[PDB]
Structures are given as C-alpha cells and as structure tokens.
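assembly run, all chains below
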Amino acid sequence: SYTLPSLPYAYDALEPHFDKQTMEIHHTKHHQTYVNNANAALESLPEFANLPVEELITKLDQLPADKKTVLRNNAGGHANHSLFWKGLKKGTTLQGDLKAAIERDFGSVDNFKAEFEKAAASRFGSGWAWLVLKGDKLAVVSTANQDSPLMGEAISGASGFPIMGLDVWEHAYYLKFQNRRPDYIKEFWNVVNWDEAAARFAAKK
Amino acid sequence: SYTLPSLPYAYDALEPHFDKQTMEIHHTKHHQTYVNNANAALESLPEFANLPVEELITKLDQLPADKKTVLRNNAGGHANHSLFWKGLKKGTTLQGDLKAAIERDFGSVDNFKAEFEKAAASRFGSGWAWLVLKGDKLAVVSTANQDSPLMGEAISGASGFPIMGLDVWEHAYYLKFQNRRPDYIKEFWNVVNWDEAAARFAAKK
Ligand SMILES: [Fe+3]
Ligand SMILES: [Fe+3]
Ligand SMILES: [O-]
Ligand SMILES: [O-]
Ligand SMILES: [O-]
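ok done. output:
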C-alpha cells in the first residue's frame, strides 16, 4: 500500500514564495486523499499493489476496466505530488549539464522559461506543466488533472521522463494568489529545486 | 461581443453560505476573463460574434480546431457563469411542477440531492455538476472544465437543457472551504435559486 511521503522540509521552508498554509493542506489533505483512494482501489489487485506508484502509472492499460480511472487519477496524483515535494527547495542555481542541455534544446534558458510559463498558464482547468526528457531531448509538456507523462501519449497526451514539474491546480495557489496564476508561476522560479532536477537528469541523460 | 453581466445581488447576498470575497473575485476576475478572451477570439469571427453565447456553444463544431478550443473554454465559461449568477438566491423553496418532476424522475428530493452531491464530489479536476432536462426527463450529469451540456454529447460527454448547476472548480470554494468541497456542496442547497430553476424548467428552452 502507498503512504504519504515525509517532506524534505518543514511546511514553511518555501516562504516567502509558496505559503506554508497551502503546503500543509496540499500535503496532509490533497496528497493524503490520493494515497487513500489509490490504496482502496488496489485492495483487490495484489500484483499491482507491489509496484512503486511510479511504475504503476506506466501500466494503466493492463488494469481491469473498472480500475483504470480511479487509479489513473489517484496513483497519478500520488506520483505527481511525491515528485513535486522533492522538486522544491530555495537557494538552488541551474547549472552544469542540465543548464547546457536546456540551452541546447531550447536555445537558451530564457526560451525555456518562456515556453514553460506559457504551458503552465495555458493549461485550462486542473493540470501540470512539465520539463521532460524524451530520449535525448528535453521538452515542455502539460497534462490534465493528475495525468503524468509517465502514463504515455495514449492516456495523458504527453510522454517522457519528468525532470521537474509545476502543479497548476487552483488548490496549489489559490489561498495566496487567487486567480493570479501567472504570479504563482513566477514564484515557482524561486523554489524549483534545480539540484534535484540535475540529479534526475544525470540519472536519465 | 459579450459583456460581463451584473450580478442580481450584492457580493455578500449569499452569505453565510457563499463568501463575498469569492463572489467578487469569481465575478470581476474569472468571469470577466472568459468574456475578454472570448471576444478576442470572436474579434476575427464576425459571422459568429453576433450570436448569443448560449447559441454559439451549440455550434462549436463549425469552428476550426484552434478557435473551437478557445471558444469552448471561454464562451462556455461565460455561458455557465451567467447561468450560475442567476441560478443563485437565498430564501427560495423547491416546489410545484419542478418538485413533482424531480420526485418523479429521482423518487424524491433527497434522492435527487444525494445523486447531485455524488456527481459534484466525483468530478475529478475542474468542472460543473448539472441538473438537466433530456426531452421529458430530469437527470444529473457533470462536465469537465467549462464544458456545457448544451455543447452536446460528443464535445462535453453530456447533453440536455441546463436547469441548474454548481461550479466545482476550486476557485469557487477554496478561500472559504479549502479542500472540503463536500461542505461547499452542502451549502449550495441553501443558495440554489429554485425560482429561476423552476422558470427554466417551465420554458424548457
Ligand atoms: Fe496538487
Ligand atoms: Fe467558476
Ligand atoms: O494537483
Ligand atoms: O469561473
Ligand atoms: O468555473
């Protein structure tokens, strides 16, 4: 069964960028719920239950028809937020191979950020914006609700190994930014953990 | 050209059920934005810009994929919220023809409320919960993002004429309820304008 992962920090660690009140609720309420609903659905699926959530979401089509939707939403939700927590930290600097790779595939860090911001801002409704690695090339893609590029094109409309990502569901930014999602996206640049992204990139490049 | 309609009441007229701060932000920011993005899209579509928003959304299939998407989301947003504002009011009582029709298609008002609450709660991500009239039968359905049953089955995955509806995007309840969407849904019963719902049921158009 899945468990709510402990965070790499206290809820107020991303202040004054991401509000601690949201961090706590996002963690203990929203993320906990994805874990509970996922476990409920996995109760009658012993073989699928052993898999780490990241591997499960890559096999949604092998699940019984009546299990696909509930797990797609909740396993996706568990996997996305687990990655999200580790993908946040103050004081990091984009550098090394990840910086060079971005400049290589996007032309420059600026083209990258502008493209990411647009993807993040144009995602209508609930969803995520991602920086993924497709084989040997990085790209910016977005998914609806709790879908993940790890689920593949057929299901999520996107694909690739997620290096980093931004949650754009309104619950991730409403208490502090309300409708102003663009300001929330700007703040994200102050808390995206480039060291973790660099770590994931070194493992997959 | 569409315009942001004025509310039938003050921002605090729905309290202590729906908070005034949300009422204002939801109206002057969210709805206002759908109106603006919708007009920008219709600015290069004269043959369509003169149609009432409710009618435009039934003809989305007559638009190129690009305009279709932007209008589906924003014309839909404009139509749904214009209906929402008029569909809210305190001190009304479910009665007469509409109440008899509900008990008839659902068994009783409580059975109806329970089915509506389930539909509203189960709508994963952003979307709406509706009470629609399909021919001569009432039904409960939900749509994603700003989709409307007026768009037809193929586009929204639902159909029928909207009688009443509840917006379950998180921006509609996060400031006061945060993650507790169910408490928000329960409060809805105190502000749903049954007089206007009864009027729409009588007109059937
Ligand atoms: Fe989230
Ligand atoms: Fe809304
Ligand atoms: O989310
Ligand atoms: O809205
Ligand atoms: O909405």
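Chain B touches chain A at residues 25, 29-30, 33, 73, 124-127, 144-146, 169-171, 174-175, 178-179 (CB under 8 Å).

Residues 122 and 142 of chain B are 9 Å apart (CA to CA).

not gonna interpret more than that til we talk
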